Amino acid sequence: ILDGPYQPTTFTPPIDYWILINSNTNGVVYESTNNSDFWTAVVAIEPHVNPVDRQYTVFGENKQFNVRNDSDKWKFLEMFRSSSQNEFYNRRTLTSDTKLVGILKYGGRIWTFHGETPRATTDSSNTANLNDISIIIHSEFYIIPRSQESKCNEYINNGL
């Protein structure tokens, strides 16, 4: 009953659906924005990376992020800014060996998974415009209704 996988693409995710992205390299996993007050780009950091500066293309710009991962698992860094003039900061991190990342539009808020598998949990971010948040997804992904969030959770924490 798993809807997918879908090819990398740019679209406005519908309300009340988890987008479950299967990361496949150490680059930008997705870029999300409404172009007013919400910019989040997730970068994937492979295990055992001493702190270092890396260049990522994010929202059409070349940006330098200092990056580290002292874990056996991958680390997916949520880099956030609320205006094109602010610099990004690492707002949240998901530490995972399943390499799946989740994003949901629900209840006026953006929900993502953070923590460390197999015990990662959801967290919310506010915005003045949830409906207009669009996403560029750089890997294969799946769509899971919120009615089946418990399944998505399981996937996030245990793999497909």
Ligand X SMILES: CC(=O)N[C@@H]1[C@@H](O[C@@H]2O[C@H](CO)[C@H](O)[C@H](O)[C@H]2O)[C@@H](O)[C@@H](CO[C@@H]2O[C@H](CO)[C@@H](O)[C@H](O)[C@H]2NC(C)=O)O[C@@H]1O
Q: For binding to ligand X (CB under 6 A), which residues are involved? A: 104, 106-109, 111, 122, 146, 149
Q: How far apart are CA 80 and CA 63, in angstroms?
A: 13
Piece in contact with a copy of itself (CB under 8 A), picked from 27-35, 43-51, 64-72, 151-159: 27-35
Among 73, 97, 143, 151, binds a copy of itself (CB under 8 A): 143
Collapse the DSSP code of 147 into the 3-class scheme (helix H, G, I; strand E, B; otherwise coil) and give the result: helix
Among 50, 51, 53, 60, binds a copy of itself (CB under 8 A): 60
Residues constituting the chain:
160
Q: How far apart are CA 148 and CA 144, in angstroms?
A: 6
Interacting positions 96-115 with a copy of itself (CB under 8 A): 106-109
Q: How far apart are CA 133 and CA 31, in angstroms?
A: 10
- The pair of three-digit structure tokens given for residue 30, joined into one six-digit string: 């997705």
Among 64, 82, 121, 158, binds a copy of itself (CB under 8 A): 82
150 is an interface residue for a copy of itself by CB under 8 A: no
We find the least distance from the C-beta atom of residue 15 to ligand X, in angstroms, to be 8
Q: Which does 11 bind (CB under 5 to 8 A by kind): a copy of itself, ligand X, none?
A: a copy of itself
Collapse the DSSP code of 154 into the 3-class scheme (helix H, G, I; strand E, B; otherwise coil) and give the result: helix
122 is an interface residue for a copy of itself by CB under 8 A: no
Phi, psi of 111 (to 5 degrees): -105, 135
Distances (CA, A) of 16 to 12, 33, 51, 146: 12, 17, 37, 5
Q: Which does 14 bind (CB under 5 to 8 A by kind): a copy of itself, ligand X, none?
A: a copy of itself
